């Protein structure tokens, strides 16, 4: 909307500047503007989009967890009543978080995903779709909790199916997708065995393909493999 008058190239340039300045809200707005120009995004541009919103929602999630913990403590036995302020402020942060998720999901639905034909782009966007439904799921408590969870699962599953067909087992997008879908199983779907199985199988299949990679590709793949191992260690 407000970025309608700025050149696409200028928005991209400014997103990169905002990243350098750790101005992630600005970075997200610039990339939102870029997406709304209607052209497909390059790999670098998709990274700017994801980095920006990851940082924004990351901060909101951290704040929501702080406030939720305080709220939970206030509802324990022996806690002397403090009024509606804790709930109200947790709700405020929660609503802002949901707004950011809805914004990202909106961009994916209008029209990033439908125009993404290459495996690398389509999987990247579907992973994002899974991730932002997962963030919605983390705060969901009502009649829509189950549908939100299934929306996350559905997006992750479509991404997994394409990634298995079209990309090598060491592909960083394939690896990152599996990492996050594994976390979905553990943290959202109450399926810790599925989480562990997915992380293990992904790790082992990547290990067997490392021999094919250059030094630079090896670096990115092994970094994510270490995250899979970290989670497995956390869970076993």
């Amino acid at each position: 909307g407000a970025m309608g008058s700025m050149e696409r190239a200028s928005l991209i340039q400014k997103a990169k500047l905002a990243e350098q300045a750790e101005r992630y809200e600005d970075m997200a707005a610039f990339m939102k503007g870029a997406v709304e120009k209607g052209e497909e995004l390059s790999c670098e541009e998709r990274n700017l989009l994801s980095v920006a919103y990851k940082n924004v929602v990351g901060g909101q999630r951290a704040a929501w967890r702080v406030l939720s913990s305080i709220e939970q403590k206030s509802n324990e036995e022996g806690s002397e009543e403090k009024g509606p302020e804790v709930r109200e402020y947790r709700e405020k942060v929660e609503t802002e978080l949901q707004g950011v998720c809805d914004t990202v999901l909106g961009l994916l639905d209008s029209h990033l995903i439908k125009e993404a034909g290459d495996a690398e782009s389509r999987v990247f966007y579907l992973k994002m779709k899974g991730d932002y439904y997962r963030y919605l799921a983390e705060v969901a408590t009502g009649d829509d909790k189950k549908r939100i969870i299934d929306s996350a699962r559905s997006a992750y599953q479509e991404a997994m199916d394409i990634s298995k067909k079209e990309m090598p087992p060491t592909n960083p997008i394939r690896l990152g997708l599996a990492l996050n879908f594994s976390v979905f199983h553990y943290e959202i779907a109450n399926s810790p065995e599925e989480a562990i199985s997915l992380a293990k199988t992904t790790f082992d299949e990547a290990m067997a393909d490392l021999h094919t990679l250059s030094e630079d590709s090896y670096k990115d793949s092994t970094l994510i493999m270490q995250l899979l191992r970290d989670n497995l260690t956390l869970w076993t």
Binding site: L179, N180, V183, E187, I224, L227, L234, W235
Partner: peptide, 5 residues
Amino acid sequence: FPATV
């Protein structure tokens, strides 16, 4: 919390 990317 577990690692995601």
